[PDB]
Amino acid sequence: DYLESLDFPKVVEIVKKYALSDLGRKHLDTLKPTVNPWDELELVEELLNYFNRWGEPPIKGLNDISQEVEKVKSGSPLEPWELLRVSVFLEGCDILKKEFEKREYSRLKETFSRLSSFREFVEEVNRCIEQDGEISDRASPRLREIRTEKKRLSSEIKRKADDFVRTHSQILQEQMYVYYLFPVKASMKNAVRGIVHHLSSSGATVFLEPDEFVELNNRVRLLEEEERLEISRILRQLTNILLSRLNDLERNVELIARFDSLYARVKFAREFNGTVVKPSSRIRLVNARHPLIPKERVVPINLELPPNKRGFIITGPNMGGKTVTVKTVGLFTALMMSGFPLPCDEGTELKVFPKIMADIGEEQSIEQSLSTFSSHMKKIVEIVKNADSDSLVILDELGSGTDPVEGAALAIAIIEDLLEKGATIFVTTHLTPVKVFAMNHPLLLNASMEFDPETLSPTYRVLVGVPGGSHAFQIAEKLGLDKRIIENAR
């Protein structure tokens, strides 16, 4: 997997932090390098100008209702709190579709005009169900009647109960009523003709239902079952509105996922000062800023591959930015080809590469017989076998992991093989014969990361044409190595 070597999912995860739901999160994970990304980029470019013009678009209610949609598809009825979620999400779909028709943005308009209006469903839910989740009296007249009769009956028992309390103050432990039954004391149990239900943990209370309370409690309990039965009919009738338009609802959920993936990419562009770069025939970075470096630390990278060139060998000091710069070419190419905007300045150009390959990093596994040399070389054999004119190749620390005289000879032959095959390559190295082969070969270009002599530090500037060295002693000193060991080394 070459995208992982170029930190591709780490940058997508940065974009996913702006998604308004886990719908766009899942859809962003579907965006991978394609040969024809123009439609995806123009959609990002359209919503980008939208933000600059009219600000953030309407987004209230655009939550992840994937679970609720499956429950309807499964045939089950939705709970009142689920119908509220689906409704506020469907009303959000209505506002989003409407808002994209009064504006100038074409591709946004034709794409999300495919949303399905559920204005009928949103009205029934807002009429039957209130904000806290209860069923409103306005739902059905039948429920309205049962509640009135249940309240009228419950007001009678509570009046009769307070009469039983004031008149039977000698048989009651606590002078009250419970749950509708009475806390009568045992021993004084057979005093009132009634039905025994529950006993106290010490055998003191006999929680009894008096004679004149049995049929009344039963009438109230039937009214409650009537209320429960009517609510289940109200919820079924509401969920059926969604069941009858299941395809319309599932299309609304995918379109919000797509819009959410576009919404996250646009807000990523404004935080990082992004630019929508489209496939060109040149590779030029203009003040490119790696999204994984903090803004306070990042130094923009300027690089341009001349048209008469095919390879870029990068040398320079340790921690000078050789690998990061080589990563930015592969990453930004894979990002544009996926449909993402790029943290760079206007004028940046990149080129569609059907084959993007990278050899970055070393893996040590005993199980996979993986060694420093083996993990690199097993990728090299992969790349060499499939490198052609459509291939862009990123080779990090070519020739490292073995005898320097043999690694530098392997490094030069591999570069030669990719060049003959018509591949575009970006290479880091710290071996001298590789630097020499780069300036001897007319298809190769040498560049180095800048090193400040007075400050003994890297400046992260790309100097084209000049090779550079590792400066290992000054970097080891900055990394904390004792001055004793270094003065010894020099």
Please identify which residue in 214, 246, 439, 466 interacts with its own copies, judged by CB under 8 A.
214
**Residue 366 C-beta: closest distance to its own copies, Å:** 5
Residue 128 in tokens = 């039957």
For residues 79 and 236, give the distance between their C-alpha atoms in angstroms, rounded to a whole number.
Answer: 10
Residues in 372-411 at the binding interface with Mg ion, rule: CB under 5 A:
372
Which of 180, 407, 437, 445 forms a contact with its own copies (CB under 8 A)? 407
Q: Which residue number, 218 or 372, has a Cβ lying nearer to Mg ion?
A: 372
291 and 272 Cβ atoms separated by less than 8 Å: yes
299 vs 464, which CB is nearer to ligand ANP?
299
User: What span, in angstroms and rounded, lies between the C-alpha atoms of 1 and 221?
Assistant: 65
Three-class secondary structure of residue 428 per DSSP: strand
Residues facing residue 350 across a β-bridge: 279
User: Is 336 a known ligand-binding residue?
Assistant: no
- Which span sits near its own copies by CB under 8 A: 42-50, 83-91, 101-109, 469-477? 469-477
State how far Cα 285 lies from the chain centre: 27
CB nearer to ligand ANP: give 299 or 419.
Answer: 299
Query: What is residue 176's DSSP assignment?
Result: S
**Contact between 73 and 31 (Cβ < 8 Å):** no
Q: What SS3 state is found at 208?
A: strand
Instruction: Out of 235, 301, 414, 447, name the contact with ligand ANP by CB under 6 A.
Output: 301
Site string for its own copies, 420-459 (x = CB under 8 A): ----------xxx---------------------------
Would you say 402 and 389 are in contact if contact means Cβ atoms under 8 Å apart?
A: no
CB of 20 to its own copies, least distance (A): 27
Is there a contact between 180 and 217 (Cβ–Cβ < 8 Å)? yes
Residue 320 is labelled as binding a ligand? yes
- State which of residues 59, 286, 384, 456 lies at the interface with its own copies (CB under 8 A): 384
Name the strand (E) or helix (H) holding 443.
Answer: none
Q: Contact with its own copies (CB under 8 A): which of 365, 389, 422, 452?
A: 365
Q: Binding residue per annotation — 323?
A: yes
Q: Which residue in 297, 385, 484, 490 binds ligand ANP (CB under 6 A)?
A: 297
Residue 9 near which of Mg ion, ligand ANP, its own copies, none (CB within 5-8 Å, type-dependent): none
* Contacts (Cβ under 8 Å, ≥6 apart) of 454: none
Measured from the CB of residue 91, what is the shortest distance to ligand ANP in angstroms?
A: 45
Q: How far apart are CA 212 and CA 446, in angstroms?
A: 101
Q: Is 174 exposed, middle or buried (0-12, 13-18, 19+ CB in 10 A)?
A: exposed
Residues 173-212 that bind ligand ANP (CB under 6 A): none
Residues 6+ positions from 122 with CB-CB distance below 8 Å: 87, 90, 91, 94
Contact mark string toward ligand ANP, 388..417, x via CB under 6 A = ---------x---x----------------
Give the relative orientation of helices 246-271 and 38-54 as an angle to the nearest 10 degrees: 70
Q: Are strands 311-315 and 424-428 parallel, antiparallel or unpaired?
A: parallel
* Angstrom distance (rounded) from CA 43 to CA 256: 14
Q: Which of residues 374-393 bind ligand ANP (CB under 6 A)?
A: 374
According to CB under 5 A, which one of 34, 66, 116, 371 is a site residue for Mg ion?
371
Characterize the bridge pairing of strands 194-196 and 208-210: antiparallel
Of 7-15, 61-69, 191-199, 318-326, the window that binds ligand ANP (rule: CB under 6 A) is 318-326
Question: In degrees to the nearest 10, what's the CA dihedral of 354, 359, 364, 370?
Answer: 70
Decide if residue 366 touches ligand ANP (CB under 6 A). Answer: yes
Smallest separation, CB 472 to ligand ANP (Å): 9
What x-and-dash track marks residues 288-307 binding its own copies by CB under 8 A?
--x-xx--------------
Binding region for ATP: 316-323
What residue ranges bind ligand ANP (CB under 6 A)?
Answer: 293, 297-299, 301, 318-324, 366-374, 397, 401, 428, 460
What residue ranges bind Mg ion (CB under 5 A)?
Answer: 323, 371-372
